């Protein structure tokens, strides 16, 4: 039987992980892509440095057309080559907006990013704070730092938001996905989540729960691994960022697996690409909510958060008379909330 | 009574200099700017590093909307954000023209600039030469620097034009404006002018008094502090430079004040901003004449000279769905001519 | 007169508003006259340049004597503030056994082994103590260490992974008393305990110090003890790059303000002898052992924080050039906080 859900593709990739990684830079699951378009045939996306004809390729590097795993499940094999706009919304999010909400710029003493969303703690005092990344919100040298908006007191005027309380660095793949997606013993998944509660003296009347440029949003869309592939992969999503305004894109790959220079395996949740030849995100967009758009009038639903700028890692080069495109990685929102024990307002 | 002259604005700025200086990057006087459009309400413009809502500013950090001066004069406050064209005219001014005049390129041993205008010495033996900025006209090590056009012989073919006779860099505010512009003694306005006379063997038949791309010009328009603000602020000007060609802009503020790292106050006379989101000038345009646009068919008249490119200092970022716009600083022509004792030439 | 370090600390804290205007740092100890240590207790003040009093306005002229809330008075000392050998080769990885001062290389940086220790509670695992700057990389909280080089850079063996570490501690908890009018007061602990791997061979670990010998128990620093017990005492250290070196303790409870206004505290200040540098780069984490007196076994007193070549040097004004200084963290308080006992 052909693969239908993400779990089958993940199992197939894990079973033949060695062969896929033997002559490749990365692996993921999704739909087969032909001539730059997304089809409806489930398959495994294999990233290579360059694309060449089979004539100049030895049989060792000739990847099999079909990969078959336990239980009779089989899938196709796809080899893919791998290598501040001034607007009213951007100005408002940069310090021109009276209220504070999603997409607002949050600057630390050293780095800056985009405000993720307003959340509340499930247990304890149930303090209301905001959720963001961990590479910008908190510097590793100082575990507990402060938050300033728009800028700290040394760079310019600003107000104090709060201090970092709970943050996550890495999580074992078993805890995150619930299944073993890799044979290497030290498999990790990046969360890059942190919660900063609002200060006691901070006014709460200036906090808004409406996302600028999108409008009202629904409940968090939990990505169930048993759901059909077409449910999540290929759906058009939108994002709001301080330096990128409002952007739209489409998701192509999920659970991208790669290895660093030290051989440690790492996983990325969501892989998306901007639409109409436009880059999905830019520098300073760390902390932008990826939201699945409205369908049949239903309220848009956040599904994840952008990890950060991918321009420093690589680009997706298309082989159909087109230049390389910019891909953006993502981090799951439901699993991050579950780990952080937070509820989105 | 609402102030309507530059003198009142200068008095208000000087009387409350400390308050503005405490949390400002610069001060000027002119017309209030709302949503990127100049208004008719006179106000003192205060320049800040960034613009934020008043809710995230301390009570001492909030500049008052209005201020009062001696005798009952009151004025508003406007906070403003602060942070080679290949053409036939440019080619001709580069050294391919049949005559040398305003806008021509003058190159020293090290740097280059644009000829200001042909002038005549009021006193002495009625020497005839030209006016330009002091920075490029004279080398800091050689008080008497030679002039070449279009390039010095060490860098390319050219002819000798003359030698620097007199130059001025800084002058006390009392002598320049006639009034005390601040509560600082060590206050000096930057004239940055030099008079370079033509060589005895140089041919005067090749000197023309007609500005290329504009036409004939009239007498220098002296700026009076008692005149209405609308006379100078908000008017349209045009300039010709050897690098940017012909460029049109608008005057936005007067008597800009700046503080250096050492704490020495400095003053700039004319503040210009380009039109249609186009830079007023670029590097190498220093010394280009600023000419007020003709009105009701009147002959255009120069109002000042251009100090140089501002790209090495900063830009003002408009907060209306647009990016930073380049601005230019200039020095009053009439006061510089009076100090240097020079007379402009407008006819052959 | 101030006889204990606590009196000097209280005096400095009470008047910590006039010495911070025109000073780069403050500490306590003995007044220095003509380049030599005196016996008069005083508070050391660090200035960029030691100009003459005549060319100094009265506002910038600091008082020479201060009085505390209990009648204690102390003077003011103003000091201007700005190898290939067999032992080194053996310590670099040529020794059959590991021990104090041994080179330990991580995936990014390398450092010196502080001392072999054990945990008081729990499994009481046996490991070693070092600095977090080298042993711990925060973009990889659990890092691996190899001696003398990591596999990617050369031959080596697996030692273990960092389990517990401390970077900053509140001043009240560390010293026990409020040392500053500032609440964002922090003290740089910089101590990480790495336990030996289960498969690691424990027969190759020695508690003897190369170039020094056997050492006794850790000598805890008591703020109530006379300054002579700690200030002006000779100390020695063994570093991977600097071999065996000796120096003298100069200052205690040094305070420094960063560019962001956050104050930080360093415990021990040491200076090399004979105009020789106390330590070089890569010697961070080396133990500081008090010189043996009257035949008593040497007792370590702290751990070197790191090289000061990137932080400045002590400039003297007696026909001599600047002398490099070294910063250290008290061993007793760090061990108490981290619950570790030196074997
Ligand atoms: N290791 C490799 N190095 C270089 N080129 C390779 C390597 N492995 C495969 N290729 C080339 O990449 C091709 C992958 O084809 P794939 O199945 O991904 O695409 P397709 O659906 O046939 O069409 P399209 O080219 O439009 O994507 C292989 O046929 C071979 O030409
Ligand atoms: N020191 C300061 N730093 C930053 N922002 C400031 C400072 N002082 C005032 N502001 C902000 O700048 C605003 C000044 O507005 P301005 O004087 O330009 O009036 P306006 O013409 O009504 O405004 P606009 O140009 O936005 O149409 C103040 O209302 C406050 O929001
Ligand atoms: N803020 C300052 N900046 C520069 N120099 C200063 C400052 N305050 C004091 N001084 C100078 O430093 C001297 C401090 O001398 P100090 O306290 O070390 O006495 P001393 O031990 O007798 O002197 P010495 O070390 O020269 O033998 C003051 O007498 C004055 O000359």
CSV table of N, CA and C in Angstrom, one decimal, chain C residues 197-323:
chain,number,residue,atom,x,y,z
C,197,UNK,N,33.9,9.3,32.6
C,197,UNK,CA,33.1,8.4,31.9
C,197,UNK,C,33.1,7.0,32.6
C,198,UNK,N,32.0,6.3,32.5
C,198,UNK,CA,32.0,4.9,33.1
C,198,UNK,C,33.0,4.0,32.5
C,199,UNK,N,33.2,4.1,31.2
C,199,UNK,CA,34.2,3.2,30.5
C,199,UNK,C,35.6,3.8,30.6
C,200,UNK,N,35.8,5.0,31.2
C,200,UNK,CA,37.1,5.6,31.3
C,200,UNK,C,37.9,4.8,32.3
C,201,UNK,N,39.2,4.7,32.1
C,201,UNK,CA,40.2,4.0,33.0
C,201,UNK,C,40.5,4.9,34.1
C,202,UNK,N,40.1,4.6,35.3
C,202,UNK,CA,40.4,5.4,36.5
C,202,UNK,C,41.8,5.2,37.1
C,203,UNK,N,42.5,4.1,36.6
C,203,UNK,CA,43.9,3.8,37.1
C,203,UNK,C,44.9,4.8,36.6
C,204,UNK,N,44.6,5.7,35.7
C,204,UNK,CA,45.5,6.6,35.1
C,204,UNK,C,45.4,8.0,35.6
C,205,UNK,N,44.6,8.2,36.7
C,205,UNK,CA,44.4,9.5,37.3
C,205,UNK,C,45.2,9.6,38.6
C,206,UNK,N,46.0,10.7,38.7
C,206,UNK,CA,46.8,10.9,39.9
C,206,UNK,C,46.5,12.2,40.5
C,207,UNK,N,46.6,12.2,41.9
C,207,UNK,CA,46.2,13.4,42.6
C,207,UNK,C,47.5,14.3,42.9
C,208,UNK,N,48.6,13.9,42.4
C,208,UNK,CA,49.9,14.7,42.6
C,208,UNK,C,49.9,15.8,41.5
C,209,UNK,N,50.5,16.9,41.9
C,209,UNK,CA,50.7,18.1,41.0
C,209,UNK,C,52.1,18.0,40.5
C,210,UNK,N,52.2,18.1,39.1
C,210,UNK,CA,53.5,18.0,38.5
C,210,UNK,C,54.2,19.4,38.7
C,211,UNK,N,55.4,19.3,39.2
C,211,UNK,CA,56.2,20.5,39.4
C,211,UNK,C,56.0,21.1,40.8
C,212,UNK,N,55.0,20.6,41.5
C,212,UNK,CA,54.7,21.2,42.9
C,212,UNK,C,54.8,20.1,43.9
C,213,UNK,N,54.1,19.0,43.7
C,213,UNK,CA,54.0,17.9,44.6
C,213,UNK,C,52.7,17.7,45.3
C,214,UNK,N,52.7,16.9,46.4
C,214,UNK,CA,51.5,16.6,47.1
C,214,UNK,C,50.9,17.9,47.7
C,215,UNK,N,49.6,18.0,47.8
C,215,UNK,CA,48.9,19.2,48.4
C,215,UNK,C,47.9,18.7,49.4
C,216,UNK,N,47.6,19.6,50.3
C,216,UNK,CA,46.7,19.4,51.4
C,216,UNK,C,45.3,19.7,51.1
C,217,UNK,N,44.5,20.0,52.2
C,217,UNK,CA,43.1,20.4,52.0
C,217,UNK,C,43.0,21.8,51.5
C,218,UNK,N,41.8,22.1,51.0
C,218,UNK,CA,41.6,23.4,50.4
C,218,UNK,C,41.5,24.4,51.5
C,219,UNK,N,42.2,25.5,51.4
C,219,UNK,CA,42.3,26.6,52.4
C,219,UNK,C,41.1,27.6,52.1
C,220,UNK,N,40.1,27.6,52.9
C,220,UNK,CA,39.0,28.5,52.7
C,220,UNK,C,39.4,29.9,53.1
C,221,UNK,N,38.9,30.9,52.4
C,221,UNK,CA,39.2,32.3,52.7
C,221,UNK,C,38.2,32.8,53.7
C,222,UNK,N,38.6,33.3,54.9
C,222,UNK,CA,37.7,33.9,55.9
C,222,UNK,C,37.8,35.4,55.8
C,223,UNK,N,36.7,36.1,55.6
C,223,UNK,CA,36.7,37.5,55.6
C,223,UNK,C,37.1,38.2,56.9
C,224,UNK,N,36.9,37.4,58.0
C,224,UNK,CA,37.3,38.0,59.3
C,224,UNK,C,38.7,37.8,59.7
C,225,UNK,N,39.5,37.0,58.9
C,225,UNK,CA,40.9,36.8,59.1
C,225,UNK,C,41.7,38.1,58.7
C,226,UNK,N,42.9,38.3,59.3
C,226,UNK,CA,43.7,39.4,59.0
C,226,UNK,C,44.1,39.4,57.5
C,227,UNK,N,44.3,40.6,56.9
C,227,UNK,CA,44.7,40.6,55.5
C,227,UNK,C,46.1,40.0,55.3
C,228,UNK,N,46.9,40.0,56.3
C,228,UNK,CA,48.2,39.4,56.1
C,228,UNK,C,48.2,37.9,55.8
C,229,UNK,N,47.1,37.2,56.2
C,229,UNK,CA,47.0,35.8,55.9
C,229,UNK,C,46.8,35.5,54.4
C,230,UNK,N,46.2,36.4,53.7
C,230,UNK,CA,45.9,36.3,52.3
C,230,UNK,C,46.6,37.3,51.4
C,231,UNK,N,46.6,38.6,51.8
C,231,UNK,CA,47.2,39.6,51.0
C,231,UNK,C,48.7,39.6,51.2
C,232,UNK,N,49.5,39.6,50.1
C,232,UNK,CA,50.9,39.6,50.2
C,232,UNK,C,51.5,38.2,50.3
C,233,UNK,N,50.7,37.2,50.3
C,233,UNK,CA,51.3,35.8,50.4
C,233,UNK,C,51.7,35.3,49.0
C,234,UNK,N,52.7,34.5,49.0
C,234,UNK,CA,53.2,33.9,47.7
C,234,UNK,C,52.4,32.7,47.3
C,235,UNK,N,52.1,32.6,46.0
C,235,UNK,CA,51.3,31.6,45.4
C,235,UNK,C,52.0,31.0,44.2
C,236,UNK,N,51.6,29.8,43.8
C,236,UNK,CA,52.2,29.2,42.6
C,236,UNK,C,51.1,28.6,41.8
C,237,UNK,N,51.4,28.3,40.5
C,237,UNK,CA,50.5,27.7,39.6
C,237,UNK,C,51.2,26.9,38.6
C,238,UNK,N,50.5,25.9,38.0
C,238,UNK,CA,51.0,25.1,36.9
C,238,UNK,C,50.0,25.1,35.8
C,239,UNK,N,50.5,25.6,34.6
C,239,UNK,CA,49.6,25.8,33.5
C,239,UNK,C,50.2,25.1,32.3
C,240,UNK,N,49.3,24.6,31.4
C,240,UNK,CA,49.7,23.9,30.2
C,240,UNK,C,50.7,24.6,29.3
C,241,UNK,N,50.5,25.9,29.1
C,241,UNK,CA,51.3,26.7,28.3
C,241,UNK,C,52.4,27.5,29.0
C,242,UNK,N,52.3,27.8,30.3
C,242,UNK,CA,53.2,28.6,31.1
C,242,UNK,C,54.1,27.7,32.0
C,243,UNK,N,53.9,26.4,32.0
C,243,UNK,CA,54.7,25.6,33.0
C,243,UNK,C,54.4,26.0,34.4
C,244,UNK,N,55.4,25.9,35.2
C,244,UNK,CA,55.3,26.2,36.7
C,244,UNK,C,55.7,27.7,36.9
C,245,UNK,N,54.8,28.5,37.5
C,245,UNK,CA,55.1,29.9,37.7
C,245,UNK,C,54.7,30.3,39.1
C,246,UNK,N,55.3,31.4,39.6
C,246,UNK,CA,55.0,31.9,40.9
C,246,UNK,C,54.6,33.4,40.9
C,247,UNK,N,53.9,33.8,41.9
C,247,UNK,CA,53.4,35.2,42.0
C,247,UNK,C,53.0,35.5,43.4
C,248,UNK,N,52.5,36.7,43.5
C,248,UNK,CA,52.1,37.3,44.8
C,248,UNK,C,50.6,37.8,44.7
C,249,UNK,N,49.8,37.6,45.7
C,249,UNK,CA,48.4,38.1,45.7
C,249,UNK,C,48.4,39.6,46.0
C,250,UNK,N,47.7,40.3,45.2
C,250,UNK,CA,47.7,41.8,45.3
C,250,UNK,C,46.4,42.3,45.8
C,251,UNK,N,45.2,41.9,45.2
C,251,UNK,CA,44.0,42.5,45.5
C,251,UNK,C,42.9,41.4,45.7
C,252,UNK,N,41.9,41.8,46.5
C,252,UNK,CA,40.7,40.9,46.7
C,252,UNK,C,39.4,41.7,46.6
C,253,UNK,N,38.4,41.0,46.1
C,253,UNK,CA,37.1,41.6,45.9
C,253,UNK,C,37.1,42.8,44.9
C,254,UNK,N,37.8,42.5,43.8
C,254,UNK,CA,37.8,43.5,42.7
C,254,UNK,C,36.4,43.6,42.1
C,255,UNK,N,36.1,44.9,41.7
C,255,UNK,CA,34.8,45.2,41.1
C,255,UNK,C,35.0,45.9,39.8
C,256,UNK,N,34.2,45.5,38.8
C,256,UNK,CA,34.4,46.1,37.5
C,256,UNK,C,33.0,46.3,36.9
C,257,UNK,N,32.8,47.4,36.2
C,257,UNK,CA,31.6,47.8,35.6
C,257,UNK,C,31.7,47.6,34.1
C,258,UNK,N,30.8,46.9,33.5
C,258,UNK,CA,30.8,46.7,32.0
C,258,UNK,C,30.2,47.9,31.3
C,259,UNK,N,30.1,47.7,30.0
C,259,UNK,CA,29.6,48.8,29.1
C,259,UNK,C,28.1,49.0,29.4
C,260,UNK,N,27.4,48.0,29.9
C,260,UNK,CA,26.0,48.0,30.1
C,260,UNK,C,25.6,48.5,31.5
C,261,UNK,N,26.6,48.8,32.4
C,261,UNK,CA,26.4,49.2,33.7
C,261,UNK,C,26.2,48.1,34.7
C,262,UNK,N,26.3,46.9,34.3
C,262,UNK,CA,26.2,45.7,35.3
C,262,UNK,C,27.6,45.5,35.9
C,263,UNK,N,27.6,45.5,37.2
C,263,UNK,CA,28.8,45.3,38.0
C,263,UNK,C,29.1,43.8,38.2
C,264,UNK,N,30.4,43.5,38.2
C,264,UNK,CA,30.8,42.1,38.4
C,264,UNK,C,32.0,42.1,39.3
C,265,UNK,N,32.1,40.9,40.0
C,265,UNK,CA,33.1,40.8,41.1
C,265,UNK,C,34.1,39.7,40.8
C,266,UNK,N,35.4,39.9,41.0
C,266,UNK,CA,36.4,38.9,40.9
C,266,UNK,C,37.1,38.8,42.2
C,267,UNK,N,37.4,37.6,42.6
C,267,UNK,CA,37.8,37.3,44.0
C,267,UNK,C,39.3,37.6,44.2
C,268,UNK,N,40.2,37.0,43.5
C,268,UNK,CA,41.6,37.0,43.7
C,268,UNK,C,42.3,37.7,42.6
C,269,UNK,N,43.3,38.6,42.9
C,269,UNK,CA,44.1,39.2,41.9
C,269,UNK,C,45.6,38.8,42.2
C,270,UNK,N,46.3,38.3,41.2
C,270,UNK,CA,47.7,37.8,41.4
C,270,UNK,C,48.5,38.5,40.3
C,271,UNK,N,49.8,38.6,40.6
C,271,UNK,CA,50.8,39.2,39.8
C,271,UNK,C,52.1,38.4,39.7
C,272,UNK,N,52.7,38.3,38.5
C,272,UNK,CA,53.9,37.5,38.4
C,272,UNK,C,55.1,38.1,39.1
C,273,UNK,N,56.0,37.3,39.4
C,273,UNK,CA,57.3,37.7,40.0
C,273,UNK,C,58.4,37.9,39.1
C,274,UNK,N,59.3,38.8,39.4
C,274,UNK,CA,60.5,39.1,38.6
C,274,UNK,C,60.1,39.6,37.2
C,275,UNK,N,59.0,40.4,37.2
C,275,UNK,CA,58.5,41.0,36.0
C,275,UNK,C,58.0,40.0,35.0
C,276,UNK,N,57.9,38.7,35.4
C,276,UNK,CA,57.4,37.6,34.5
C,276,UNK,C,55.9,37.5,34.6
C,277,UNK,N,55.3,37.2,33.5
C,277,UNK,CA,53.9,37.0,33.4
C,277,UNK,C,53.5,35.8,34.3
C,278,UNK,N,52.4,35.9,35.0
C,278,UNK,CA,51.9,34.8,35.9
C,278,UNK,C,51.5,33.6,35.0
C,279,UNK,N,50.7,33.9,34.0
C,279,UNK,CA,50.2,32.9,33.1
C,279,UNK,C,50.0,33.4,31.7
C,280,UNK,N,49.8,32.5,30.8
C,280,UNK,CA,49.5,32.9,29.4
C,280,UNK,C,48.2,32.3,28.9
C,281,UNK,N,47.9,32.4,27.6
C,281,UNK,CA,46.6,31.9,27.1
C,281,UNK,C,46.6,30.4,27.2
C,282,UNK,N,45.4,29.9,27.5
C,282,UNK,CA,45.2,28.5,27.6
C,282,UNK,C,45.4,28.0,29.0
C,283,UNK,N,45.8,28.8,30.0
C,283,UNK,CA,46.1,28.4,31.4
C,283,UNK,C,44.8,28.6,32.3
C,284,UNK,N,43.7,29.0,31.7
C,284,UNK,CA,42.5,29.2,32.5
C,284,UNK,C,42.1,27.9,33.2
C,285,UNK,N,41.7,28.0,34.5
C,285,UNK,CA,41.3,26.9,35.3
C,285,UNK,C,42.4,26.3,36.1
C,286,UNK,N,43.6,26.8,35.9
C,286,UNK,CA,44.7,26.2,36.7
C,286,UNK,C,44.6,26.6,38.2
C,287,UNK,N,44.9,25.6,39.0
C,287,UNK,CA,44.8,25.8,40.5
C,287,UNK,C,45.9,26.8,40.9
C,288,UNK,N,45.5,27.6,42.0
C,288,UNK,CA,46.5,28.4,42.6
C,288,UNK,C,46.8,27.9,44.0
C,289,UNK,N,48.0,27.4,44.2
C,289,UNK,CA,48.4,26.7,45.4
C,289,UNK,C,49.3,27.7,46.3
C,290,UNK,N,48.9,27.9,47.5
C,290,UNK,CA,49.7,28.7,48.4
C,290,UNK,C,51.1,28.1,48.7
C,291,UNK,N,52.1,29.0,48.7
C,291,UNK,CA,53.4,28.6,48.9
C,291,UNK,C,53.6,27.9,50.3
C,292,UNK,N,54.3,26.8,50.3
C,292,UNK,CA,54.5,26.1,51.6
C,292,UNK,C,55.2,27.0,52.6
C,293,UNK,N,54.8,27.0,53.8
C,293,UNK,CA,55.4,27.8,54.9
C,293,UNK,C,55.6,26.9,56.1
C,294,UNK,N,56.9,26.9,56.6
C,294,UNK,CA,57.3,26.2,57.8
C,294,UNK,C,57.0,24.7,57.6
C,295,UNK,N,57.2,24.2,56.3
C,295,UNK,CA,57.1,22.8,56.0
C,295,UNK,C,55.7,22.3,55.8
C,296,UNK,N,54.7,23.2,56.0
C,296,UNK,CA,53.3,22.7,55.8
C,296,UNK,C,53.0,22.4,54.4
C,297,UNK,N,52.1,21.5,54.1
C,297,UNK,CA,51.7,21.1,52.8
C,297,UNK,C,51.0,22.2,52.1
C,298,UNK,N,51.3,22.5,50.8
C,298,UNK,CA,50.7,23.6,50.1
C,298,UNK,C,49.2,23.3,50.0
C,299,UNK,N,48.4,24.4,50.1
C,299,UNK,CA,46.9,24.3,50.0
C,299,UNK,C,46.4,25.2,48.9
C,300,UNK,N,45.7,24.7,47.9
C,300,UNK,CA,45.1,25.5,46.9
C,300,UNK,C,44.1,26.5,47.5
C,301,UNK,N,44.0,27.7,46.9
C,301,UNK,CA,43.1,28.7,47.3
C,301,UNK,C,42.1,29.2,46.3
C,302,UNK,N,42.3,28.8,45.0
C,302,UNK,CA,41.4,29.3,44.0
C,302,UNK,C,41.7,28.7,42.6
C,303,UNK,N,40.9,29.1,41.6
C,303,UNK,CA,41.1,28.7,40.3
C,303,UNK,C,41.3,29.9,39.4
C,304,UNK,N,42.3,29.9,38.5
C,304,UNK,CA,42.5,31.0,37.6
C,304,UNK,C,41.3,31.1,36.6
C,305,UNK,N,40.8,32.3,36.5
C,305,UNK,CA,39.6,32.5,35.6
C,305,UNK,C,40.1,32.4,34.1
C,306,UNK,N,41.2,33.1,33.8
C,306,UNK,CA,41.7,33.1,32.4
C,306,UNK,C,42.8,34.1,32.2
C,307,UNK,N,43.4,34.1,31.0
C,307,UNK,CA,44.4,35.1,30.7
C,307,UNK,C,43.8,36.5,30.7
C,308,UNK,N,44.7,37.4,31.2
C,308,UNK,CA,44.3,38.8,31.2
C,308,UNK,C,44.9,39.7,30.1
C,309,UNK,N,45.5,39.0,29.1
C,309,UNK,CA,46.1,39.7,28.0
C,309,UNK,C,45.0,40.5,27.2
C,310,UNK,N,43.7,40.1,27.2
C,310,UNK,CA,42.7,40.8,26.5
C,310,UNK,C,41.9,41.7,27.5
C,311,UNK,N,42.3,41.8,28.7
C,311,UNK,CA,41.6,42.6,29.7
C,311,UNK,C,42.4,43.8,30.2
C,312,UNK,N,43.7,43.8,30.0
C,312,UNK,CA,44.6,44.9,30.5
C,312,UNK,C,45.8,44.4,31.3
C,313,UNK,N,46.6,45.3,31.7
C,313,UNK,CA,47.8,45.0,32.5
C,313,UNK,C,47.9,46.0,33.6
C,314,UNK,N,48.7,45.6,34.6
C,314,UNK,CA,49.0,46.5,35.8
C,314,UNK,C,50.2,47.3,35.4
C,315,UNK,N,50.0,48.7,35.3
C,315,UNK,CA,51.1,49.6,34.9
C,315,UNK,C,51.7,50.2,36.2
C,316,UNK,N,53.0,50.1,36.3
C,316,UNK,CA,53.7,50.6,37.4
C,316,UNK,C,54.4,51.9,37.0
C,317,UNK,N,54.8,52.8,38.0
C,317,UNK,CA,55.4,54.1,37.7
C,317,UNK,C,56.7,54.2,38.4
C,318,UNK,N,57.5,53.1,38.4
C,318,UNK,CA,58.8,53.1,39.0
C,318,UNK,C,59.8,52.4,38.0
C,319,UNK,N,60.3,53.2,37.1
C,319,UNK,CA,61.3,52.8,36.1
C,319,UNK,C,61.1,51.4,35.5
C,320,UNK,N,59.8,51.0,35.4
C,320,UNK,CA,59.5,49.7,34.9
C,320,UNK,C,58.2,49.8,34.1
C,321,UNK,N,58.1,48.8,33.1
C,321,UNK,CA,56.9,48.8,32.3
C,321,UNK,C,55.8,48.1,33.0
C,322,UNK,N,54.6,48.0,32.3
C,322,UNK,CA,53.5,47.4,32.9
C,322,UNK,C,53.7,45.9,33.1
C,323,UNK,N,53.0,45.4,34.2
C,323,UNK,CA,53.1,44.0,34.6
C,323,UNK,C,51.7,43.4,34.4
